[PDB]
Design a protein around this ligand. Structure first.
Ligand SMILES: *[C@@H]1O[C@H](CO)[C@@H](O[C@@H]2O[C@H](CO)[C@@H](O[C@@H]3O[C@H](CO)[C@@H](O)[C@H](O[C@H]4O[C@H](CO)[C@@H](O)[C@H](O)[C@@H]4O)[C@@H]3O)[C@H](O)[C@H]2NC(C)=O)[C@H](O)[C@H]1NC(C)=O
Ligand code: 5GF
Ligand code: CA
Ligand code: CA
Lengths: 855, 83
């Protein structure tokens, strides 16, 4: 990084003004004579004792253990921004009742208890309790600051950064508030930062910054703002989980301090104070709470969970077809091949280079014959060219972002001079969606999906490589008001384009660089332009875990690193790490050497093929975890503390993670490693090494030996993992194949697991209830398949070809019972050394109820 | 009467030959299906050069043999392109 291109808190006038306020007696007080209580909210006026500015507090109890606090000016010169399109519904409220009242305080009960809110009038404070347990305080350190709008102080008004002058017509309008979390020492979230999963105290340095920015050659372990911003913070202790969602789309700085107690301060450039307090008590309760507000992860089409091969750039159609054929000649599975910016006509999006891609439909038909897909890049910057139809239409319809003088903003990006469509305008989004029809996007087909890059937006000659603060958007809002949702709107409009081009039948696949709260509803995200170095391989875990905690489950990092050339050992370890992360794509910068996996020496090719085969065989498990994310809002990739909340030794772990509740992964992430230290948690828990079947009792730190082909993965006792053991060239080839169930017995001789199946790519699971959700359960010598959702029916040829039971003794006989058939006897194999029992060919449909009895 | 794997690893009845479950470590009991991870399917390609393909390419929905015999129960109907 060139740090001089990005503002520190002292270089952002509003951050410097807010941060200069230190703990003390707040000048704000509530005027209790103005208190009004209704069934949905409590409202009361607040006054600043010195300036006499009046604000309005709207306090609400909400269903599912949440509280909403909104503060705005009582009589503003002009309305303040309130974030649209992020919340999926108007949250259901819970009634507040006055249970206590004096001259300086009001005690409110939420519904019939146990939650209570204490409003103190002077100084203004809110305390949130469950019975007699204080959960959180608001304005405890008196850091609330609401800069009222003055008539349209260094840098309070006009402000320059480098050569860029922000005219700042509305002057200082920042808002900020502090929260106290007694009993909390560990906080997480607020992505995107290339930093530790457990957030650091910011007292002696910079606050964490949330401002979507394109940071060239970003560095590690620092609080600089990266490409996306999710203003959600989680707090974990042995006793409880809490969440804070600060709904503001302006540049935001977050200060974290410790005392046991953690204090959090949010400071935003503009808008209102709008904050949701998610009171848990469990971390799963917090996930459900946040999902009720911003929605859940969109169910990926199955192919998007396979392996993606990309680079900047494949040369032409012949290169794409040679890469396709390379995977098949080297028996390596791959679902998608990607086309970066050189596929277009001079970076005019929605076009094709006429020499390199003259016949895109023919290229797409060949990929379709191999049951593969293609992804093409489409960025939100439009070349200024009178011969380019997209530019002419957007210019003619006034759909570009404007400068204050009313002219269309022009900046520098990949096509040279370019304009920026105003994605905050709902008509611009409708136009964009419609551009993805097969009639408008000539050369596209149903196996062509999309990648949105540079959607911060990236502006090469702009301040901090983004758009001017005082550019003007739909409704007269300034760029400063909306910045962090610009990328989300690009992502949303593209996803809607792919749904609509199919007549609403096909599920979309869109990868986005920039994001905000709610982006989980539109597709995948990735950690941007990382580097081919061991420390960047390591940091992919805390970065994708920080995203998973705040709802963005479909995350990944570029396999091999984007910048520079990885050594073969690093490329192998990166394939192994990526094979166990939700979004799995190899990508590389323009000046790097080619790194298709068959270009390496045989030892490296073989370790990469092994990692690809592991991933493809686990697709039924991955698909089921994503279905659970889509239905419940639970993360796919999880920190160990989510599964072991009372194990304080797991609270900062970031070199290991879990997939659901069933697999624990510790990828090798150091050159020349001959072993790894694996922490296997759980009192009375057992773990099975999935390669050797060796059983290990928790809690312990195991030193596991490793070779180049090793991927340290353990299955938790008590779980059933489904796999497709017949690895084929792509997921479409496999999606109707038989399943093998891997049953890992707990010390009590029990196990359970689910399996979701559908057609792999449409909305039929929701519009026609065409799916299966099975529950597999093992207890007392019997394995049973039953329906976990009887509404789902699916005609499928999928059958159970095998059952592998770890921790089982040798039976004398194995009997299968299924409705509509006579009783069956199965053959079996048993290894007495490992206590692994293999049941041969059950032969039963996955859609049927059945039971297998041992002895 | 039984079948012995070409590698000598097991002896199974003929009913476990092409039964869509892998019983031989060499894949020799499943020459006609996709059940074995290391098996091979023979493209007879009558009137042209014969080819062997991976067993994972039998009924994968992709036309691998020029005679189309690898796709017999997948839904993909392959045309004869041997010439
Ligand atoms: C909204 O908030 C309410 C209130 O917090 C919440 O209900 C509570 O859920 C917790 C579970 O998270 C309940 O706690 C249990 O209490 C019983 C006794 O009443 C205990 O037996 C339970 O013990 C288990 O867990 C312990 C560790 O936590 C283990 O040590 C033990 O061995 C057991 O396995 C557990 O403590 C609590 O009773 C309720 N409280 C009320 C008032 O209902 C509710 O779930 C939240 N709702 C939503 C939608 O978020
Ligand atoms: O489009 C060229 C590119 F460099 O720019 C953008 C993304 O950050 C990259 O991954 C991409 O390859
Ligand atoms: Ca067989
Ligand atoms: Ca085939």
């Amino acid at each position: 990084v060139d740090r001089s291109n990005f503002k520190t808190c002292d270089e952002s006038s509003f951050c410097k003004r807010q941060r200069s306020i230190r703990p003390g007696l707040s000048p704000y007080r509530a005027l209790l004579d103005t208190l009004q209580l209704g069934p949905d909210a409590l409202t009361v006026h607040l006054i600043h004792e010195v300036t006499k500015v009046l604000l309005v507090l709207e306090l609400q109890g909400l269903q599912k253990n949440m509280t909403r606090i909104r503060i705005d000016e009582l009589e503003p010169r002009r309305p303040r921004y309130r974030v649209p399109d992020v919340l999926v519904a108007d949250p259901p409220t819970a009634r507040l009742s006055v249970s206590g009242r004096d001259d300086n305080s009001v005690e409110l009960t939420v519904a019939e208890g146990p939650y209570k809110i204490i409003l103190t009038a002077q100084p203004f404070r809110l305390d949130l309790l469950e019975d007699r347990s204080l959960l959180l305080s608001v304005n405890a350190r008196g850091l609330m600051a609401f800069e009222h709008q003055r008539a349209p102080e260094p840098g309070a008004w006009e402000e320059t950064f480098k050569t860029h002058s922000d005219s700042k017509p509305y002057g200082p309008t920042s808002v900020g508030l502090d929260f106290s979390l007694p009993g909390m020492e560990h906080v997480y979230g607020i992505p995107e930062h290339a930093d530790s999963l457990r957030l650091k105290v910011t007292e002696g340095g910079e606050p964490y910054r949330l401002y979507n920015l394109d940071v060239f050659q970003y560095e590690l372990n620092n609080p600089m703002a990266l490409y996306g911003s999710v203003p959600v913070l989680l707090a974990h202790s042995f006793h409880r989980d809490l969440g804070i969602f600060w709904l503001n789309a302006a540049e935001t700085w977050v200060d974290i301090s410790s005392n046991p107690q953690t204090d959090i301060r949010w400071m935003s450039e503009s808008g209102i104070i709008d904050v949701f307090l998610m009171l848990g008590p469990s971390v799963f309760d917090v996930f459900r709470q946040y999902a009720s507000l911003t929605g859940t992860q969109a169910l990926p089409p199955l192919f998007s969970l396979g392996y993606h091969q990309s680079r900047w750039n494949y040369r032409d159609e012949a290169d794409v077809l040679e890469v396709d054929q390379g995977f098949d000649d080297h028996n390596m599975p791959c679902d998608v091949i990607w086309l970066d910016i050189e596929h277009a006509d001079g970076k005019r999006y929605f076009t094709w280079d006429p020499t390199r891609f003259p016949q895109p439909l023919n290229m797409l038909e060949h990929l379709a014959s191999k049951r593969r897909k293609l992804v093409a890049i489409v960025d939100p910057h439009i070349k200024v060219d009178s011969g380019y139809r997209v530019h002419e239409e957007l210019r003619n319809h006034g759909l570009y972002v404007k400068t204050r003088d009313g002219s269309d903003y022009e900046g520098w990006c990949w096509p040279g001079s370019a304009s920026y469509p105003d994605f905050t305008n709902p008509r611009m989004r409708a136009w964009w969606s419609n551009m993805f029809s097969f009639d408008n996007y000539e050369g596209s087909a149903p196996n062509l999906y999309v990648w949105n890059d540079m959607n911060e937006p990236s502006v090469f000659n702009g301040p901090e490589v983004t758009m001017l603060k005082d550019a003007v958007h739909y409704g007269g809002w300034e760029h400063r008001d909306i910045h962090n949702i610009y990328g989300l709107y690009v992502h949303m409009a593209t996803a809607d384009g792919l749904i609509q081009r199919s007549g609403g039948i096909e599920r979309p696949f869109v990868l986005s660089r920039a994001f905000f709260s709610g982006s989980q509803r539109f597709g995948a995200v990735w950690t941007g332009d990382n580097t081919a170095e061991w420390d960047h391989l390591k940091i992919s875990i805390p970065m994708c875990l920080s995203l998973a905690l705040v709802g963005l489950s479909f995350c990944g990092a570029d396999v091999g690193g984007f910048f520079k050339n990885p050594e073969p050992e690093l490329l192998v370890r990166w394939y192994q790490m990526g094979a166990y992360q939700p979004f799995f794509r190899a990508h590389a910068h323009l000046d790097t050497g080619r790194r298709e996996p068959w270009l390496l020496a045989s030892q490296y090719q073989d370790a990469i093929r092994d990692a690809l085969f592991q991933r493809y065989s686990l697709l039924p498990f991955w698909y089921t975890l994503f279905y659970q994310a889509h239905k419940e809002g639970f993360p796919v990739m999880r920190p160990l503390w989510v599964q072991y909340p009372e194990d304080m030794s797991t609270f900062s772990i970031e070199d290991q993670f879990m997939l659901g509740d069933a697999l624990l992964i510790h990828p090798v992430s150091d050159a020349g490693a001959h072993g790894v230290q694996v922490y296997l948690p759980g009192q009375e828990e057992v773990w099975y090494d999935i390669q050797s079947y060796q059983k290990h009792h928790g809690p312990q730190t195991l030193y596991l030996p490793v070779t180049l082909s090793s991927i340290p993965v353990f299955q938790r006792g008590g779980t059933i993992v489904p796999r497709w053991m017949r690895v084929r060239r792509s997921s479409d080839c496999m999606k109707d194949d038989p399943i093998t169930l891997f049953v890992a017995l707990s010390p009590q001789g029990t196990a359970q697991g689910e399996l979701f199946l559908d057609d792999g790519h449409t909305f039929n699971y929701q519009t026609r209830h065409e799916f299966l959700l099975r529950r597999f359960s093992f207890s007392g010598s019997t394995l049973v398949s039953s329906s976990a959702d009887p509404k789902g029916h699916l005609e499928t040829p999928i059958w159970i070809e095998r059952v592998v039971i770890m921790g089982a003794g040798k039976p004398a006989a194995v009997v299968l019972q299924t409705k509509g058939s006579p009783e069956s006897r199965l053959s079996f194999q048993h290894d007495p050394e490992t206590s692994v029992l293999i049941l041969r060919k059950p032969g039963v449909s996955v859609a049927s109820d059945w039971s297998i009895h041992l002895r | 009467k039984p079948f012995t794997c070409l590698d000598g690893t097991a002896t199974i009845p003929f009913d476990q030959v092409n039964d869509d479950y892998c019983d031989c470590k060499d894949g020799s009991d499943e020459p006609g299906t996709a059940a074995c991870p290391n098996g091979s399917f023979h493209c007879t390609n009558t009137g042209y050069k014969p080819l062997y393909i991976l067993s994972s390419r039998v009924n994968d929905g992709v036309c691998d043999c020029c005679d189309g015999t690898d796709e017999y129960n997948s839904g993909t109907v392959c045309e004869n392109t041997c010439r």
